[PDB]
Structure 1
Amino acid sequence: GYTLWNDQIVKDEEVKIDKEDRGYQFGDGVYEVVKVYNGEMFTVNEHIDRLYASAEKIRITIPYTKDKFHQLLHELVEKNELNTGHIYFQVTRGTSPRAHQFPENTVKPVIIGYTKENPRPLENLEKGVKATFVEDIRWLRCDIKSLNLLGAVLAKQEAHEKGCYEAILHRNNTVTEGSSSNVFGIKDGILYTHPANNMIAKGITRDVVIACANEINMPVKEIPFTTHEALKMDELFVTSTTSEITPVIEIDGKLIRDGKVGEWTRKLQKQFETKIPKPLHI
C-alpha cells in the first residue's frame, strides 16, 4: 500500500530505514495508534496531542504542526482506502552515527505511518476474555509512549502462551495497566483505575471511558488497587484503541464474580458506542 514517510505519502517500496536510525538502535522514539471506523478516524486529535506530548517529554522536536500531521493522516487513510482498522505512526530522533547522547540539533526526526484493516473485536466485546497477572518490571517513565516496549513484549507473550488475551501488570502487588491497555475495576457500582502518573500510559480510551462514566452518572475513583482486590471486583475490563472496552472475566483460572460480563461494563459499552463515528441514515 502506501506509507507516510516524513511528510510524504509514498509507496511502501520507496521507504528506506537506515541502520543507525536511533529508533532501531536505542528505541529512541514515540508512537501512537488511531482507530478508523468505516473511513473516519476516532479521536485523532487527542492522539496527535499525545504524540507531541510524548515526543516533547524525551526532547524530540516534530518538524511540523499538528494540522500538517492531521492532513497527512487523512491523506494516508484515503490513499490506502482504509475502511475499518487502524493507523500506526511513530517518530524517532533520526539517523546519526551511534552515540548515546542526542545528536546535533541539525538531525531530522524520522516519521513513519501506515494502516492496517482490522475489524472490531466482536467476540471479545461480547464474551469477555481471560487474563493473567505479570510482574511489572518496566522502567519508571511509563507515562511516555516510547519504542522501548520489550517489557510489554515479554508480558504479552507470557499471557499468549497460557491462552490469555492480556497480561495485567502489577508493581509491588499494585495493578498498574496491561501490556497494551489500561485496567479498570468495578465494585458496588463504582469505577476504579490507577491514576495517570509515571506508572502508566494515560490512554485515550481510558479517558473516553471515564468521560462515559461521568455521563451515565457513575462515580469514578482514580485509586490504585492490588492483585488481591482486583480478584474481588464485581467487574473488570481492559481498554485500548484496538480493544475498546474488553471485559475480563477470569484471571489465572479465577472467575471475576460469576465469569459473565457485568451490567456496568455493558452500560459503559453502550455509552462508548454513541461516540463512535457513524453516518445519520445509512
Structure 2
Amino acid sequence: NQLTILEAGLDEIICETVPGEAIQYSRYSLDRTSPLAGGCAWIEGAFVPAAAARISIFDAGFGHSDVTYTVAHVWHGNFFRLEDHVERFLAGAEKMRIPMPATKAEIMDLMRGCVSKSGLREAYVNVCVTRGYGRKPGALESQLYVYAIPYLWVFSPIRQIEGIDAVIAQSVRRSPANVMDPWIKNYQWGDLVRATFEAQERGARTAFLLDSDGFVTEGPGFNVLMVKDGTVFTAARNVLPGITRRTALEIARDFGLQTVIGDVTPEMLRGADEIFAATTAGGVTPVVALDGAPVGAGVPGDWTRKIRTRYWQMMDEPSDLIEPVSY
C-alpha cells in the first residue's frame, strides 16, 4: 500500500532537471545561519523551522477537514501570481464560511516572510485557514498556517519534459459540487487517493476522475487540459479553477488558439491531439498515454511543449505576474 502523490522535492532542495531544457533551479549557496533556512512555517504567531511546525490535534481543520488553502510557488527567487493565489484563497474561505483571521495584505506578508526566512529561491508556499480548535489563548477562532518548503513536483522535472501516462478512473468518482465542491481547494482527498491507488494498480502514473454524469474533471492535485484542432478544452464543473490552468489558457490565447472552459467527455480525451496536466507543483506536464493507448502521436505534443516553455520563461520575465522576494 505504498502511495505516490508527489514524485520529487519532499526533502531535496535541488532536484535533477533535464540539461538544456526550460526548467533550471537557481545556482546558489543557502546561508544556514538561521534555523529557519531551508523551510520556515508561521504557526499561531511565530515563524518556526519547518521540522518543528506542528498544529493542535484538536483543530477542526484536522478532525473535520474544516480547512481550505492555496499553494503559490517561488522560482528563481520570484513569487508567481501571489495576489491571484491569495484572492482565490480568500474567495474559497468565504464560500466555506471560514472567517479569515488576517487581511489580504497580512497573508501576502506572512507568505513573503516564510520564503525570505527560508532563503529558498525555488519554493512551495502553502497557506491554509482552518475553523480552529476553539478559543485562542488571550474573537475569531480560525487559524492561519503558512509554510515555505523546497519546491514540490507532482511529476518529476524529467517527466515534465518526457511526459506521463494516465488512466480514466473507473473505481472512484470526483467529489460532487453539492457534497464538497472541488471549486474550493481543499484537503479532502479520499477520492483522489483512491484514484491514485487505482492508477498504480493499472500500471499508470496517475488518474483522471469523472464526475457523476461521466464528464472529465481533474486529477489528484492537477487540472486536465486537452488540445484538439486549434482549441484547448478543460472542465468547468467539479474542478478547481487552477491558476496554472489560468496561465496555460492565457498563453494558448496569446498563441492564437481558442480556449473553452466547459464540459469534457472521455470521447473528447480519446480523440485529442494533446493532453496535459497543470498544477503549481510542477507546471505543465504532457500526458502521452491514456488507458494504455497513445495520446495523439504518443510523444509530448507540439502545443504542450510551447505552453510549457513559455510558462517557465515567465518566471524570469518582468511582468505583473512575478514579484521578487526580498531575502
TM-score scaled by length of structure 2: 0.76
Q: Does 1:229 align with 2:268?
A: yes
In structure 2, the CA distance between the partners of 1:83 and 1:185, relative to structure 1 (3 Å rule), is same
**Partner Cα separation in structure 1 for residue 51 and residue 298 of structure 2:** 47
Q: Does 1:90 align with 2:128?
A: yes
Offset at residue 117 of structure 1 (A): 1.5
In structure 2, the CA distance between the partners of 1:273 and 1:11, relative to structure 1 (3 Å rule), is closer
Q: How does 1:256-275 map to 2 (within 5 A)?
A: 256-275=295-314
Q: Which amino acid aligns with 1:82?
A: L
Q: Does 1:192 align with 2:239?
A: no
User: 5+ residue gaps in structure 1?
Assistant: 98-105
Q: Does 1:110 align with 2:143?
A: yes
> Equivalent residue for 1:102?
none
Offset at residue 224 of structure 1 (A): 1.7
Q: What CA deviation, in whole Å up to 9, does each residue of 1:82-137 have, x standing for no partner? A: 1213112211011139xxxxxxxx34211222222237743112111001111424
> Equivalent residue for 2:64?
26
SS at match of 2:207: strand
**Partner Cα separation in structure 2 for residue 53 and residue 166 of structure 1:** 29
Q: How does 1:172-183 map to 2 (within 5 A)?
A: 172-183=213-224
Contact 2:207 2:219 in 1 (8 A): yes
**Partner Cα separation in structure 2 for residue 12 and residue 262 of structure 1:** 38
**Partner Cα separation in structure 2 for residue 46 and residue 81 of structure 1:** 23
Give the count of matched residue pairs: 269
> Equivalent residue for 2:184?
144
Q: How does 1:234-253 map to 2 (within 5 A)?
A: 234-253=273-292
In structure 2, the CA distance between the partners of 1:170 and 1:71, relative to structure 1 (3 Å rule), is same
**Partner Cα separation in structure 2 for residue 27 and residue 212 of structure 1:** 35
Structure 1 runs (4+) deviating above 6 angstroms are none
Offset at residue 268 of structure 1 (A): 1.6
SS at match of 2:305: helix
Calculate percent identity across the aligned residue pairs.
28
**Partner Cα separation in structure 2 for residue 213 and residue 137 of structure 1:** 27
Q: What CA deviation, in whole Å up to 9, does each residue of 1:253-281 have, x standing for no partner? A: 111122111111122223323321368xx
Q: Which amino acid aligns with 1:84?
A: E
In structure 2, the CA distance between the partners of 1:250 and 1:64, relative to structure 1 (3 Å rule), is same
**Partner Cα separation in structure 2 for residue 174 and residue 14 of structure 1:** 42
Aligned equivalent of 2:160, options 125, 136, 152: 125
SS at match of 2:216: strand
SS at match of 1:186: strand
**Partner Cα separation in structure 2 for residue 269 and residue 15 of structure 1:** 34
**Partner Cα separation in structure 1 for residue 49 and residue 141 of structure 2:** 21
Contact 2:134 2:141 in 1 (8 A): no
Contact 2:74 2:124 in 1 (8 A): yes
Contact 1:183 1:193 in 2 (8 A): yes
Q: How does 1:209-224 map to 2 (within 5 A)?
A: 209-224=248-263
**Partner Cα separation in structure 2 for residue 16 and residue 126 of structure 1:** 36
Q: Which amino acid aligns with 1:159?
A: A
